[PDB]
Amino acid sequence: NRPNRLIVDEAINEDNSVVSLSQPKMDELQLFRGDTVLLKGKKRREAVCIVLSDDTCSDEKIRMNRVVRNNLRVRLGDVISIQPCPDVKYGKRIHVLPIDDTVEGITGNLFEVYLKPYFLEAYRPIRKGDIFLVRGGMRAVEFKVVETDPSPYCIVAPDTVIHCEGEPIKREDEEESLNEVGYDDIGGCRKQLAQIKEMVELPLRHPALFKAIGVKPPRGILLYGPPGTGKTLIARAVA
Amino acid sequence: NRPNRLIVDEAINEDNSVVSLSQPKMDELQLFRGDTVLLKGKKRREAVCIVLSDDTCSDEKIRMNRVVRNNLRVRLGDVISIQPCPDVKYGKRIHVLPIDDTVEGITGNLFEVYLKPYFLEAYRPIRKGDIFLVRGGMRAVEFKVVETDPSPYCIVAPDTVIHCEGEPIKREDEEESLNEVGYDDIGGCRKQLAQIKEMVELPLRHPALFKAIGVKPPRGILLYGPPGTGKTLIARAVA
Ligand SMILES: Nc1ncnc2c1ncn2[C@@H]1O[C@H](COP(=O)(O)OP(=O)(O)O)[C@@H](O)[C@H]1O
Ligand SMILES: Nc1ncnc2c1ncn2[C@@H]1O[C@H](COP(=O)(O)OP(=O)(O)O)[C@@H](O)[C@H]1O
């Protein structure tokens, strides 16, 4: 049955690009804590990240972040195949530009003052055709690459140079904005949010199974608490 | 007055094809506990089942199941004639197929994995033009025969072979779906359900008698209890 694909869930870590697995995971694929990992999915697209070792998260499970779930076009309850990729990469020239939807009121240079400080001491990889999201600068902005060195061989380094043209390109309907609300945006409701997972993930992720079995799913859920507790973004995130 | 026909009622046994009678019943028709019985009715159709001996059900009464009440087109308050039929039968080739109304989401082979396991150690008979119902497999599905060996001589055996064509035939309005609610679907309400039998079976089963006598039937029945006790499927089953 090809025991290599595992289900996807939410990661409790607050890091940006960190993938956490269980102890008997890197011992089979002989990968270290700072190796290069390549992930695939639908739409004939690939991905690259950094695998981090952890033995406190769970017993046998792989964590997976939100900034790359929308990037690789992956949703919950899906299978993902992981394999090591010991390929030496080195970025030479990069060219990123933001979308004209979140750059209102920003003028002047914006590449040598935000991007350069956060790239160093991170060595984060990047693949062709990906929309990364960065927090900071009293705002939430993103950038998209359209033309750089041929994939892959993309490694951030202070010696790398950057350039701009001066004409942002509008986004399309294929991607989804990460500025909206997700499971990571809920704080404090752990036990209560854990219940909705085992009541709304079965009928919404597996429709043919429900139109196959005779089980009746719940037809209504009532949330409680005083106003402002977060009854609205929970429903928006689970959607 | 031909003392051979008896009224029909509901059977408390949970078995699929079991007919229970009283002690002075098989002693007149010299039939054993595992003989072959042939039953007739309207529409010039016959039936075949297995008579089971019981001395705890009642004093002088014949039980009769739901899966064959709709099959032989029999309703309550009707007469049924029973006679032994010591005919040796042996099935050779069978060909059953389901109706395209309850096979949504089912693919692959479905004859050597469900039908074969449940047929053995049962020796259940089957007549031509009957819609049997089987419970199990996390669903409620049925099958209908359209072409097999000439009637009767239909006995299930592991040596028998089966085949399929690949085109289900839709059901007609002559038969009724057994997936709906009947008296056997009510659990717990025994004393209360027993009362509705002696108040709604007289005016609905014998209309000419009520338009003959001057008795006024009840014009309204009020059911009680907290929600979910089953006030709705009781009314749907008695209809
Ligand atoms: N438990 C929570 N977790 C994260 N954010 C919250 C929570 N509760 C409130 N908020 C924040 O407060 C803001 C106002 O929430 P509000 O719409 O009043 O919630 P509700 O509609 O349930 O009263 C939201 O933008 C949300 O980000
Ligand atoms: N006494 C009972 N016997 C069998 N099934 C029941 C009974 N009570 C409830 N149910 C089941 O519970 C489900 C919901 O019943 P419901 O429609 O709430 O009854 P009511 O309309 O009387 O409140 C039904 O599908 C029924 O099968």
Question: What's the topology here?
Answer:
This is part of a larger assembly, with 2 copies of chain A (239 residues).
Chain A: E1 5-6, E2 19-20, H1 23-26, E3 37-40, E4 46-49, E5 51-52, H2 66-69, E6 80-84, E7 93-94, E8 96-97, H3 111-119, E9 131-136, E10 139-145, E11 161-162, H4 191-205, H5 207-210, H6 231-237
Parallel strand pairs in A: 2-5, 7-11
Antiparallel strand pairs in A: 1-6, 3-4, 3-6, 8-10, 9-10
Bound molecules: adenosine-5'-diphosphate (2 copies).
PDB class: hydrolase
Keywords: p97, VCP, tera, Inhibitor, CB-5083, hydrolase
Entry title: Cryo-EM structure of human p97 bound to CB-5083 and ADP.
How does this structure look, described?
It is classed as hydrolase. The entry lists the keywords p97, VCP, tera, Inhibitor, CB-5083, hydrolase. This is part of a larger assembly, with 2 copies of chain A (239 residues). With 239 residues, the first copy, chain A, is an alpha+beta fold. In chain A, 18% of the residues lie in helices and 16% in strands. Chain A has 6 helices and 11 strands. Chain A has helices at 23-26, 66-69, 111-119, 191-205, 207-210, 231-237, and strands at 5-6, 19-20, 37-40, 46-49, 51-52, 80-84, 93-94, 96-97, 131-136, 139-145, 161-162. In chain A, the strands form 4 sheets. Chain A has a 4-stranded antiparallel β-sheet, with no helix packed on it. In chain A, strand 9 (131-136) and strand 10 form a beta hairpin. The first copy, chain A, is globular and about 60 Å long. At the A-B interface, loops of A face loops of B. The complex binds adenosine-5'-diphosphate (2 copies). One adenosine-5'-diphosphate (ADP) binds next to helix 6 of chain A.
